[PDB]
Amino acid sequence: EKLSPNPPNLTKKMKKIVDAVIKYKDSSSGRQLSEVFIQLPSRKELPEYYELIRKPVDFKKIKERIRNHKYRSLNDLEKDVMLLCQNAQTFNLEGSLIYEDSIVLQSVFTSVRQKIEKEDD
Numbered sequence: 060e061k062l063s064p065n066p067p068n069l070t071k072k073m074k075k076i077v078d079a080v081i082k083y084k085d086s087s088s089g090r091q092l093s094e095v096f097i098q099l100p101s102r103k104e105l106p107e108y109y110e111l112i113r114k115p116v117d118f119k120k121i122k123e124r125i126r127n128h129k130y131r132s133l134n135d136l137e138k139d140v141m142l143l144c145q146n147a148q149t150f151n152l153e154g155s156l157i158y159e160d161s162i163v164l165q166s167v168f169t170s171v172r173q174k175i176e177k178e179d180d
Contacts, residue, residue, distance in 0.1 A: 062128040072175055073125045073136050079117055079171040080140065080164060092160040092167070093118060098141055112150055116143045133172060140168050 064070070081093045099117045102109045109115065121139050123129075130136040147161035 060079045063096075065131065068124065069133075072129070072179065073130060073133065074110065074122075075175055076117065076133070076168070076171050077121060077140075078135070079175075080168050083164070083167045083171075085160075092159075092164050095157055095160070096106050096147065096164075108150055112172065114142060115146060118143070133176075137172070141165060 065073075081097075082091070083093065084091050097118045099115050099120075100108060117137055121136070121143065124139065125136065130139070143163040144165045150156050151158040151161075153159075
């Protein structure tokens with residue numbers, strides 16, 4: 060089944076937010092924080108990930124869920140981004156590069172969402 064499309068301005072805003080979060084780079088090192096979250100590792104590769112993380116998500120899935128109108132609100136989108144980051148914090152250890160990048164990405168999402176929505180008045 061096809062879902063009823065969101066209003067196109069809502070879709071547009073979801074896309075702009077996710078694009079900005081994905082492109083965000085650490086200023087000192089140039090590292091794209093999101094690059095490790097684009098594509099989940101396979102269950103073949105990393106079976107233990109799928110033992111611990113019950114609802115995996117990556118940015119490929121998030122973009123899919125935007126395109127297919129699964130998210131009906133920015134709150135819906137935000138929850139999946141926060142879940143993506145939660146999962147990173149469960150599977151990786153506090154103080155690790157990947158854990159700490161996921162913490163920053165939570166704040167980037169919030170800041171980017173607000174910039175975009177304030178722009179739209």
